[PDB]
């Protein structure tokens, strides 16, 4: 094993190579919530903005695993990116509810990770998840979430003005 | 008595004490709807801030009264801050309207004191309530009102646009 | 439930109201300890002031607590905040003495509920109080405990100039 | 009468020029004190500038009544100033508790005048008093107050170094 290795199960070092691929899939799904704002047919700036920048720091999450995995001696083992499970993403509302689902998966990984640490009694590992990850996937599913519950306010999705007045003052 | 006592009505003294006591009341009344809008399900930020704000400004009230009372010789004795009187507050107009009518319940208090320092010919308490208290009360109740009115022109309690469109205009 | 909730169990969003009491009720008790040294027949001052500013330490400790519940998707709770359990605090000792026993009850009831938090595995909660208030508590406790050795040294209860000396070279 | 008299009555002016006296008698008290602690056999000299401040602002008290009186027209008539009570003052407790009971003497000949011009329906004069004279005297009785408790728990007047003490970090 690597000379730096200490207290790194085999198991805890396989899952953070799964939770890095699902962090990279989670920013490939947010690449395409941006693509699909931008279109001219679609056209909410803003929005299309928020989903590029989320996209953006679901990659830096699954770069510091990367970093993370090597401080440990574990070896980074990557797999495919898994394409988005849609190609268009209806509208704001709809696109806001499948950021909470995704957010909320990514959260339910990190937490059955947090576990795994604790049961192979990994400190290190736990206050990592604690520190850089926990606390900013609840900050995140909040904010989606308040979202979601001005988008109806607003009437989505029916009211286009809603809409567009969301586009233009929440984001 | 007090060393520093001087024409201060027993009366007066009880009176600035259940004066704070309200204020307090006031001021976790004010907290209790800062909670309410920044629910997930509810997520009107803006408006709870400003009952956040509300509720720091009644508790500086109820403390100017702690430090008035020891001015004047008289010995604060603190009760039981009721919880509101509500759990929820419905919406943002039947919020300020809880809010008006709060206000106006402190507003009478203060008047009320204030009259009874008249009777008591206590001319540095009547000053007190004039120059600390009685102008603010009057502002923030008109404030209120006026807000009133504008979230009943933009439809509320039924129109979910116009309650956004006051949280992201008017506070 | 909450769209936003993940992993938050009944029990802990409970206890997490029954923690913001009792934040409530510390405040209000360093409330009335800081107008009682604000007295003509008192007249310590800076032992006022550092009691006033532990009320406002523990209103911005309730406040986190209900901005937590929030973001966990849980409801705040409100109820009556007691009244402390004396009106007059004797002297600078006997204040600190009650000050230090209130600190480790608030502290108790931080691990109870970090306790409560371990067996129904929610991190995010113990992470919470670990970062926010567990250290808070054990600078505070050593603090106040610091001062009343100094105290005892100083020859309190009945020593009148060693109380001076405290209010004006500890505070 | 004075072109600019309008409700202005007689008994308020000669009330005002018997407080325009009692000022000055406050301010020749004072600056005795100063010249008792300014002597080499008494040497506390915070303590002696302390009543050297107080002189002056009693004297400041008196300018703004001459000021008052012929902005309403009516006319500055001036007596003797009486020498103070004592010729030395004993100690700094001895001292304090006279000009407690010097401060309480002149806040209720402020309260006789504006019971006065209540009376005599002459709003101008009550917020005179109450806007200039009756918070400062207020605030004056509670520091000396404040004062005394501390030069008594200080074991005045029999410790002299209770005496220093407060002498170097009281004033
Ligand atoms: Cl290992
Ligand atoms: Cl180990
Ligand atoms: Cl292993
Ligand atoms: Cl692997
Ligand atoms: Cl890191
Ligand atoms: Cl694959
Ligand atoms: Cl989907
Ligand atoms: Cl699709
Ligand atoms: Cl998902
Ligand atoms: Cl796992
Ligand atoms: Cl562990
Ligand atoms: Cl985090
Ligand atoms: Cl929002
Ligand atoms: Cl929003
Ligand atoms: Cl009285
Ligand atoms: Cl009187
Ligand atoms: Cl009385
Ligand atoms: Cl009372
Ligand atoms: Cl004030
Ligand atoms: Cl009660
Ligand atoms: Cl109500
Ligand atoms: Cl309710
Ligand atoms: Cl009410
Ligand atoms: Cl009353
Ligand atoms: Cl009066
Ligand atoms: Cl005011
Ligand atoms: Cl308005
Ligand atoms: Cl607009
Ligand atoms: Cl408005
Ligand atoms: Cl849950
Ligand atoms: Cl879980
Ligand atoms: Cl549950
Ligand atoms: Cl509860
Ligand atoms: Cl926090
Ligand atoms: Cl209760
Ligand atoms: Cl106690
Ligand atoms: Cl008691
Ligand atoms: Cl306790
Ligand atoms: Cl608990
Ligand atoms: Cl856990
Ligand atoms: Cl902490
Ligand atoms: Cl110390
Ligand atoms: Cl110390
Ligand atoms: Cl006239
Ligand atoms: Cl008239
Ligand atoms: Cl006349
Ligand atoms: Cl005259
Ligand atoms: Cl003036
Ligand atoms: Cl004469
Ligand atoms: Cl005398
Ligand atoms: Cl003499
Ligand atoms: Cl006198
Ligand atoms: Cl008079
Ligand atoms: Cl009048
Ligand atoms: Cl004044
Ligand atoms: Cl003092
Ligand atoms: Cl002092
Ligand atoms: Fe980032
Ligand atoms: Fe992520
Ligand atoms: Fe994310
Ligand atoms: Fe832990
Ligand atoms: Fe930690
Ligand atoms: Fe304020
Ligand atoms: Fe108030
Ligand atoms: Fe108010
Ligand atoms: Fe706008
Ligand atoms: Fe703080
Ligand atoms: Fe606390
Ligand atoms: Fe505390
Ligand atoms: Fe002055
Ligand atoms: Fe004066
Ligand atoms: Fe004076
Ligand atoms: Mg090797
Ligand atoms: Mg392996
Ligand atoms: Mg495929
Ligand atoms: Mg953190
Ligand atoms: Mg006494
Ligand atoms: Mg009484
Ligand atoms: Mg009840
Ligand atoms: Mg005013
Ligand atoms: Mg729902
Ligand atoms: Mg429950
Ligand atoms: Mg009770
Ligand atoms: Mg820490
Ligand atoms: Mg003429
Ligand atoms: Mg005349
Ligand atoms: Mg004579
Ligand atoms: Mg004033």
Not at 35 to 45: C, I, N, Q, S, T
Not at 105 to 127: E, G, I, W
Request: aromatic share 10%.
């Amino acid at each position: 094993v690597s000379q730096v290795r200490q207290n790194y199960h085999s198991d805890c070092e396989a899952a953070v190579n799964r939770m890095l691929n699902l962090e990279l899939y989670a920013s490939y799904t947010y690449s395409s919530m941006y693509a699909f704002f931008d279109r001219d047919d679609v056209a909410l700036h803003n929005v299309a903005e928020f989903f590029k920048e989320h996209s953006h720091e679901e990659r830096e999450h699954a770069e510091k695993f990367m970093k993370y995995q090597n401080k440990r001696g574990g070896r980074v083992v990557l797999q495919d990116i898994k394409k988005p499970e849609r190609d268009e993403w209806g509208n704001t509302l709809e696109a806001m509810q499948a950021a909470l689902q995704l957010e909320k998966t990514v959260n339910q990984a990190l937490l059955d990770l947090h576990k795994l640490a604790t049961d192979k009694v990994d400190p290190h590992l736990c206050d990592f998840l604690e520190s850089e990850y926990l606390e900013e996937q609840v900050k995140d599913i909040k904010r989606i979430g308040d979202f979601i519950t001005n988008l109806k306010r607003l009437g989505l999705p029916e009211n286009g003005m809603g809409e567009y007045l969301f586009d233009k003052h929440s984001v």
